[PDB]
């Protein structure tokens with residue numbers, strides 16, 4: 001009765017063999033320092049639960065990014081902070097440099113290392129075959145590291161990957177939707193951003209894992225090597241799954257759904273239709289041939305699969321023939 005259970009193939013019991021203080025973020029005590037050390041310079045934007053500023057560390061004058069939290073659930077704040085502190089110093093993980101409060105207004109804020117980013121709609125067109133393989137390997141390091149530390153990012157997308165192209169420096173950012181992996185846990189599927197949602201999220205399969213980040217990465221990789229942003233462009237969560245099925249086909253979807261005994265919402269049977277599995281070559285053309293290779297396509301193919309257990313892990317990925325020219 002109910003969905004078939006599932007476990008992560010890798011780093012399954014990493015939180016289980018650690019003490020509660022590592023993953024029990026609700027018992028985390030947060031110390032808020034003084035924000036006077038930083039001077040707001042420019043509104044960058046208005047992230048989901050925050051406003052974000054370029055700031056300046058008055059003391060050393062080094063550049064910084066300040067995320068001023070809207071009033072959010074104390075619980076989520078502690079999660080993000082605890083996750084950031086556990087992953088700090090890890091490869092290509094953004095550094096939580098400080099946690100502070102404005103003395104007068106009391107609004108909490110997280111302060112991060114600054115990356116001199118090129119917007120991904122300017123950057124991605126510039127990128128060569130070598131570039132894409134390099135930066136994908138940098139992302140993979142961040143995801144292997146963070147999966148090994150018991151954590152799923154759950155919001156992998158071009159917006160959360162900061163690239164200083166001059167310095168070939170990449171940072172995986174915004175850990176606000178990240179969560180700790182506990183095998184057996186039935187999680188909230190209202191995560192990631194639409195275009196990067198894995199089919200497990202869309203069919204409401206809750207016992208998901210690190211392999212969610214591997215789907216999202218694939219979506220990014222497809223958009224990059226094919227020059228089509230976003231790759232899967234759905235008008236909502238239901239239609240998102242239709243956009244995937246028009247590429248991966250309907251037969252492997254229904255076989256995935258039956259295998260896990262997933263109860264498909266009735267909205268799907270009207271819209272899903274019947275679609276064959278398309279070859280990845282169908283997407284290759286004169287303007288992107290130079291970024292595609294047999295290896296690129298094989299790597300992509302082993303990321304973008306319905307069955308999350310069958311996707312490459314981030315370690316398996318880093319060993320793929322696609323990365324040989326970089327490693």
Ligand SMILES: CC(=O)Nc1ccc2c(c1)c(-c1cc(NC3CC3)n3ncc(C#N)c3n1)cn2CCC(=O)O
Nearest residue numbers: 044045046047052065067112113114115117162173174
């Ligand atoms: C800070 C965070 O966790 N999320 C977040 C949310 C919105 C953000 C940013 C980060 C950055 C952002 C920008 C840069 N750099 C660009 C040159 C200014 N850097 N660099 C490091 C981080 C971090 N963390 C960072 N975050 C810009 N925006 C505005 C996006 C929008 O409104 O569309």
Ligand SMILES: [Cl-]
Nearest residue numbers: 177179188191
């Ligand atoms: Cl959540």
